[PDB]
Structure 1
Amino acid sequence: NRHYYSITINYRKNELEQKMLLNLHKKSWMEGLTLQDYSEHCKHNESVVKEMLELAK
């Protein structure tokens, strides 16, 4: 610390970064049309998830 100090750091975000980056990250965790990979799990509940249910039991 002798002859060597630091300073605080803050951030800033406008509405364009909030909506564009927030919707961009939600879309980054979502699908393209948002209806594609739903039926994949809805129909995999009878094929693959059954093994996870038997192991869960």
Structure 2
Amino acid sequence: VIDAFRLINANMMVLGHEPRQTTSNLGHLNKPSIQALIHGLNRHYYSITINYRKNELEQKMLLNLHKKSWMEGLTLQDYVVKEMLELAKNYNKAVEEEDKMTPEQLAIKNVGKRHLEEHVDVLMTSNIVQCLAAMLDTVVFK
């Protein structure tokens, strides 16, 4: 929500406010446009374009921070996973079985001038990962 403002004197208002000599940057500046309250008090002011300073070392350090710290990427404890999986798959199987009625009716209906349910990518990923865990189970250890 941060923003940057700068005031304009009332002496040169006869002269142009902000002499513009670049279309791309002026349009980018206008893209934020002006806020409701901003117009309510936009006068004697003219917002100035802001941007995050180039960031590589800090960017790289943060990126390394995320994997291990800001989300689960310890990579050594990275791999319930066999306890609750049965129950999660039970829920989703029952739900998909139920949802299968709506496509049935949809097909039943003629030309006549909620089948899209997906629910399969989730199962795919979850149980394929669980099966892959065999790789850790049988080789990575012992």
Which of the five TM-score ranges fits, normalised by the shorter chain?
Answer: 0.3 to 0.5
> Quick one: distance in 2 between partners of 1:51 and 1:31?
20
How much does 1:20 deviate? 0.7
The change in CA–CA distance for 1:29 and 1:2 in structure 2 (over 3 A counts) is closer
How much does 1:13 deviate? 3.0
The change in CA–CA distance for 1:56 and 1:21 in structure 2 (over 3 A counts) is closer
> Quick one: distance in 2 between partners of 1:36 and 1:2?
57
Q: Secondary structure at the match of 2:84?
A: helix
The change in CA–CA distance for 1:11 and 1:35 in structure 2 (over 3 A counts) is same
Compare CA radii of gyration and give the structure with the larger one. 2
How much does 1:26 deviate? 1.9
- The sequence identity of aligned pairs, in percent, is 96
Q: Which has the higher contact order (CA 8 A, sep 6+)?
A: 2
How much does 1:29 deviate? 3.6
User: Which structure is higher in helix share?
Assistant: 1
How much does 1:51 deviate? 8.6
The change in CA–CA distance for 1:33 and 1:6 in structure 2 (over 3 A counts) is closer
How much does 1:28 deviate? 1.4
Q: Secondary structure at the match of 1:50?
A: coil
Q: TM-score when scaled to structure 1?
A: 0.46
How much does 1:15 deviate? 2.3
How much does 1:17 deviate? 0.9
- Map of 2:83 onto structure 1: 51
Aligned residues: 48
The change in CA–CA distance for 1:51 and 1:25 in structure 2 (over 3 A counts) is closer
Q: TM-score when scaled to structure 2?
A: 0.24
How much does 1:34 deviate? 1.9
Q: Deviations over 1:21-54 (max 9, x none)?
A: 111122214558522241xxxxxxxxx5789767
Contact 2:72/2:78 (<8 A) preserved: yes
